[PDB]
Amino acid sequence: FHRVDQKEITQLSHLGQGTRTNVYEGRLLRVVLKVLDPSHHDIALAFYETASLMSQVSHTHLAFVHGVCVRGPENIMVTEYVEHGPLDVWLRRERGHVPMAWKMVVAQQLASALSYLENKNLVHGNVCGRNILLARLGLAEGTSPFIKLSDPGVGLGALSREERVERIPWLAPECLPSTAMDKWGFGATLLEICFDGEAPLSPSEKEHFYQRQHRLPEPSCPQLATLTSQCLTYEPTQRPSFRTILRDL
Amino acid sequence: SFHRVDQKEITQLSHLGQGTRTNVYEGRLRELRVVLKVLDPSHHDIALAFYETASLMSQVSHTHLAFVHGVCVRGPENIMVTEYVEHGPLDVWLRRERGHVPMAWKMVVAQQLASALSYLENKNLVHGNVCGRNILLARLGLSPFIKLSDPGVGLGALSREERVERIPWLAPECLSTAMDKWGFGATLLEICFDGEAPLRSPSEKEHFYQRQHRLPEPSCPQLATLTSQCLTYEPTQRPSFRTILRDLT
Ligand SMILES: CNC(=O)c1cnc(NC(=O)C2CC2)cc1Nc1ccccc1S(C)(=O)=O
Numbered sequence A: 001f002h003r004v005d006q007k008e009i010t011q012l013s014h015l016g017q018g019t020r021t022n023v024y025e026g027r028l029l030r031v032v033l034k035v036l037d038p039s040h041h042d043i044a045l046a047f048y049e050t051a052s053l054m055s056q057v058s059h060t061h062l063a064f065v066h067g068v069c070v071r072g073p074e075n076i077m078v079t080e081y082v083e084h085g086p087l088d089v090w091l092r093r094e095r096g097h098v099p100m101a102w103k104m105v106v107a108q109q110l111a112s113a114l115s116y117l118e119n120k121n122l123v124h125g126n127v128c129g130r131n132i133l134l135a136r137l138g139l140a141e142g143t144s145p146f147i148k149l150s151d152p153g154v155g156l157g158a159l160s161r162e163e164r165v166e167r168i169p170w171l172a173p174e175c176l177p178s179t180a181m182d183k184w185g186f187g188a189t190l191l192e193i194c195f196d197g198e199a200p201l202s203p204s205e206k207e208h209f210y211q212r213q214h215r216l217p218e219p220s221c222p223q224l225a226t227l228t229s230q231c232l233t234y235e236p237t238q239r240p241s242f243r244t245i246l247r248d249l
Numbered sequence B: 001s002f003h004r005v006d007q008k009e010i011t012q013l014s015h016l017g018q019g020t021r022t023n024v025y026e027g028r029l030r031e032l033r034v035v036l037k038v039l040d041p042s043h044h045d046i047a048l049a050f051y052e053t054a055s056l057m058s059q060v061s062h063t064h065l066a067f068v069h070g071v072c073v074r075g076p077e078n079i080m081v082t083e084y085v086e087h088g089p090l091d092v093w094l095r096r097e098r099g100h101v102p103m104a105w106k107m108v109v110a111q112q113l114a115s116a117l118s119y120l121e122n123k124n125l126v127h128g129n130v131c132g133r134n135i136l137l138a139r140l141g142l143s144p145f146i147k148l149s150d151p152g153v154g155l156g157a158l159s160r161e162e163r164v165e166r167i168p169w170l171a172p173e174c175l176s177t178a179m180d181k182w183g184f185g186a187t188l189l190e191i192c193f194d195g196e197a198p199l200r201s202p203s204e205k206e207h208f209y210q211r212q213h214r215l216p217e218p219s220c221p222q223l224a225t226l227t228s229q230c231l232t233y234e235p236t237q238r239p240s241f242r243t244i245l246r247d248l249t
């Protein structure tokens, strides 16, 4: 990844929080600055691995990483500013007013981005609505939405059990104690999209759900029902490839 | 004339901005995303000028003219149900993107604006409010796709104070289809100066017209002869949009 100097970045309004990060609007060009918390070197390394991965990839439905600013105890990931922000926040504002054809486009754009990663044997590890950003809302007639999948943030391997339980239902069950984990994440993300930004699923309740090997609900739309059932299986090897998912969509 | 919309058919969403005697909101029409233009509690002559605008815009059909779905009457409020366009007003956009807008891009917008205005000219119909604010981007294109908005409350119903506020877009004789030629000319300058209008305080603006002073020359030399021809104080000397459209090629 590219190194950014603090002289090149301006930090503005706080947009939200990520895992171990505070997300701010900023300037470099309008950017999004992901400020890592004062961390251990493992978390800093996991954050760098994410800047590296996202700097070596290029896809229309993958948000851009400008680089990393590393000065003293601060680690700032300089990323692409996407107009309408997180998908879940949007779907929740527009509940009951989001057409099924709109949801279908977002699914296909998300699956093409994920098929690209799959072909390069690269893992995202954090596919959820929050990490799906809306470039274009596709609200006017003859316009489609345009999504860009965000960086996965601090890589999953560096996270505590407590933080992995918080990622349920998007976290693949095998990760509670592979490019197959993005198939679960994708499946749980179709459900969230279908339930208008509302996720299917307290910490103990969520852990017990996975431990008891219970399955997530069926989507509100029947079109995605077979797909979600195939994606949200506890056997990682049985999940379809995004090549198949993209064809089937 | 125009179609009548019932309040039961419209959902009023977030505020987008203000127009002359109006508050512009995003909305929904039973479901199509619309833009609601809510007229202030007004006297019958003001509401008549708003109706005249709904009528004019309902009887026209051009790709570069925004659609009018109809008019709603909600207690003392007169709502104009009009087209939702993805990227909103042009001036707002050009200001955000200053120094990053190519001259070839500005040329397309000029031609599209002149096509729309040539159509009105051929039908001996007047817009009366051609300015960047009233140019809506359906497609960004970085080519672009504009839609000229409705003129709002017709010029004839406005006070001298409100006409002084429309300077430099307001034709001096208004302090005829020839007035849209001035508006068009002042709009080329605004586009050229990246959303920045040439002119200031109310007295300063009135004195500019009273003293018969002329607006600046564009930053691009291609549009210099055209703007000079359009921004003449003699309405009869302004070229037709037939000529303007030919010359822009
Ligand atoms: C790669 N860049 C981004 O992730 C990112 C880009 N643009 C926006 N735009 C807006 O919010 C616009 C103001 C609406 C939000 C973004 N992140 C964000 C913001 C708030 C919370 C959590 C996150 S996240 C995805 O980093 O978890």
Ligand SMILES: CNC(=O)c1cnc(NC(=O)C2CC2)cc1Nc1ccccc1S(C)(=O)=O
Binding pocket: B016, B017, B018, B019, B024, B035, B037, B066, B067, B082, B083, B084, B085, B086, B087, B088, B089, B133, B134, B135, B136, B149, B150
């Ligand atoms: C005929 N319909 C419109 O004029 C109209 C249509 N769509 C948008 N879309 C967006 O803003 C999208 C969110 C970007 C804006 C519009 N007008 C608008 C909005 C804010 C202030 C003033 C006006 S204006 C021109 O009516 O003065």
